[PDB]
From a paper:
RAD51C is an enigmatic predisposition gene for breast, ovarian, and prostate cancer. RAD51C is a central member of the RAD51 paralog family of proteins that share sequence homology to RAD51, the recombinase during homology-directed DNA double-strand break repair (HDR), and with incompletely understood functions in this pathway downstream of the classical cancer susceptibility genes BRCA1/26. RAD51C binds XRCC3 (CX3) to form a heterodimer, and separately with RAD51B to combine with the RAD51D-XRCC2 dimer into a hetero-tetramer (BCDX2), whereby all paralogs except RAD51B are considered essential for cellular survival. Yet, recently RAD51C replication functions distinct from HDR functions were described, including replication fork protection, fork restart and fork reversal.
Using purified apCX3 core complex without the resolution-limiting RAD51C NTD, we solved the 2.6 Angstrom (Å) X-ray crystal structures of CX3 complexed with ADP-BeF3, a non-hydrolysable ATP mimic, bound in the active sites of both RAD51C and XRCC3. Importantly, apCX3 crystallized with three independent dimers (totaling 6 chains and over 1,800 residues) in the asymmetric unit and conserved superpositions. We therefore were able to fit and refine three independent structures of the CX3 heterodimer into the electron density maps: this provides high confidence in the defined interfaces and conformations. The overall apCX3 structure shows extended interfaces between RAD51C and XRCC3 with extensive contacts between the RAD51C CTD and the XRCC3 NTD, CTD, and a distinct linker polymerization motif that connects the subdomains. In all three heterodimers, the structures reveal a conserved CX3 ATPase dimer interface mediated by the bound ATP transition state analog. ADP-BeF3 is buried deep within the complex sandwiched between CX3 subunits, with the RAD51C Walker motifs coordinating the BeF3 phosphate mimic. Likewise, two lysine side chains charge-stabilize the terminal BeF3 group such that ATP hydrolysis and release of inorganic phosphate could in principle destabilize the active CX3 interface by introducing a net charge in a buried environment, jeopardizing complex stability. Yet, apCX3 strikingly differs from published structures of RecA and RAD51 family members with the unique positioning of the XRCC3 NTD, which is rotated ~90 degrees compared to RAD51-RAD51 interactions. This repositioning of the NTD results from a unique XRCC3 linker protein-polymerization motif, with residues at the N-terminal region of this motif driving the NTD reorientation compared to RAD51. The reorientation of the XRCC3 NTD creates a structure in which XRCC3 resembles a C-clamp, with the two sides of the clamp formed by the XRCC3 CTD-RAD51C CTD (CTDI) interface and the unique XRCC3 NTD-RAD51C CTD interface on another surface of RAD51C (NTDI).
Numbering used by the authors:
A (entry chain A): 84 to 283, 289 to 357
B (entry chain B): 5 to 261, 268 to 345
The structure:
Amino acid sequence: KDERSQLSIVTFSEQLDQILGGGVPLTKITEICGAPGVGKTQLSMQLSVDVQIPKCFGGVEGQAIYIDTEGSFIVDRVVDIATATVQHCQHIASIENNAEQADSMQSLTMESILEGIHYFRCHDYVQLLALVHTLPDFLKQHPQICLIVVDSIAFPFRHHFEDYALRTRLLNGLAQSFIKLAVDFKLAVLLTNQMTTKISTSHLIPALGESWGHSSTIRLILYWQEKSRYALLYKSPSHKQISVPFQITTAGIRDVCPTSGDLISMDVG
Amino acid sequence: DLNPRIIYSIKKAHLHDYGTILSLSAADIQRMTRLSASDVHQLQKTVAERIRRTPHTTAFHLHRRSGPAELNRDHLTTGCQQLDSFLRGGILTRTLTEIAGESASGKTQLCMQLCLTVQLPEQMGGLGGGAVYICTEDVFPNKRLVQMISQLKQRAHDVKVKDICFTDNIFIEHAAELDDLHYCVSKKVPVLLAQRHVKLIIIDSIAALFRCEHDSQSLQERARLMQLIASKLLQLANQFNVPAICVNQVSDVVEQHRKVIPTLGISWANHVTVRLMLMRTNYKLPVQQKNIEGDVIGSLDVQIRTMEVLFAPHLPNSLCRFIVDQDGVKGLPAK
Ligand SMILES: Nc1ncnc2c1ncn2[C@@H]1O[C@H](COP(=O)(O)OP(=O)(O)O)[C@@H](O)[C@H]1O
Ligand SMILES: Nc1ncnc2c1ncn2[C@@H]1O[C@H](COP(=O)(O)OP(=O)(O)O)[C@@H](O)[C@H]1O
Ligand code: BEF
Ligand code: BEF
């Protein structure tokens, strides 16, 4: 309805922003799946930075919540991405020569970007439910928050749950909780997910079973092909099935060439 | 647990574990007890607030580093400045670092070197504590360790390092089978972390114990024991602020029918924070042998080896050369 509910968070890869519909959409759930090292945490860090891009540079100019359940949030890496994002905005302000942009760069620093990343560390799945349930009290106090990252949603639930049906309603309780948070506070919910195998040539599938992923609007699979990273659009409202190449540099998520990359694939129909 | 008045329904409702409460909906609470959304909301609010959890902070605090102390990590030096910069500081605490590599690639040498550097004072890049080395394969190479210790004391020009008794603070355990390794990690190691100030956990090798069972009932059991051992390792690393390092044989010839693939599969990989791979090359480096009071006498060849970052949250997929000599593992300047 309002103009905030239709905004999107850029990934700094335009090829990625295409298949996402302009970026990671607010008020929806976006899911990132992939083998280790493919870039789930890299994309999570990038979005936590990109959501803070000021509106005079075309950004949402919000803040981020980073819920880290694996412990792979090394702040020295975020400094890399934050530095590069500020340098990119500084470049725009210099090319476009607008006075408001030059004013934004006065307060747009790597440190301010770090200050816009609210960080929560969960060690077990019980701490995650306790945090999600106390989030409304926190978000009402920080209404400028436009992004919630859970990195990852899968890791706390890989234990030997004796009642997998209990794990299922645990995951669906969270999926309903994140959908409600996404609409009620008009922020993007980014969930990262691990891959697992299936025996009954073994192949990889997203974790948490077939009961998981229904409440996710967009689902991406990051994967390697030769020595190149790719993002397969697994689930989307457009129903199209696309793969786009991207890369991960010291600056963060970027397009592989400026510019290059396109495939087609689809489903019935 | 908190107030007894709302309790009259949940004690009678067969649900007194704090974790189980937070799963179901407020209307489902009304389904189980004759309570209102006013009570169902306040019931789950107090439970969620009761659960102890590390408090909120910002990335800026992590950078400063002025948030909760249990979120700070420390760097353990590799002993070489060149490898330390390649790792942006060295081995990180509260992480699981996997060191994979082919046979005689230097995996054991590197781990033994960290058993020395962990004992250095923090000003020198150490963590000021001992190490536990869990062996599943060969006998520990004590002759090689004593050589490295002597070379370290000889080359250190500070009495603070010379007066360290390295052998007394390196605790060698042998785990013959997968179940025994789980006992050692879950029961033996925490004693060392608490009572003897061990600041480094090494397992060499977790993959070797996956030798030959091949019973699916065991294979479910083999994978069940992996998750438990890997989860316990991560839990100890965070709780005691120590690095956990697992050595793994990279299984080359079957997967690649010079390219390589680590052994334990994707379920194991999902626990690894940083995975490095060591390989041998055919190239050799001429180095002058000079000893101490005697002088440079001639050149000998050392094997040139590679170290590669397969994945890490903060490192590029870079490669770096290194060698092994009397002192241990030494990096080579780029490039
Ligand atoms: N400082 C850096 N410079 C360049 N690339 C990096 C840097 N840090 C990490 N990367 C890339 O990102 C990868 C880590 O991705 P990550 O998101 O942690 O994986 P996962 O999807 O398992 O979370 C590394 O393997 C590396 O290729
Ligand atoms: N004192 C030394 N000087 C030079 N090279 C050594 C020394 N000790 C061992 N090496 C080399 O290290 C390799 C063995 O390394 P090791 O730690 O056993 O690796 P891995 O555990 O992967 O077999 C051998 O190739 C050997 O040539
Ligand atoms: F660091 Be990634 F989320 F595996
Ligand atoms: F000595 Be090595 F770990 F094979």
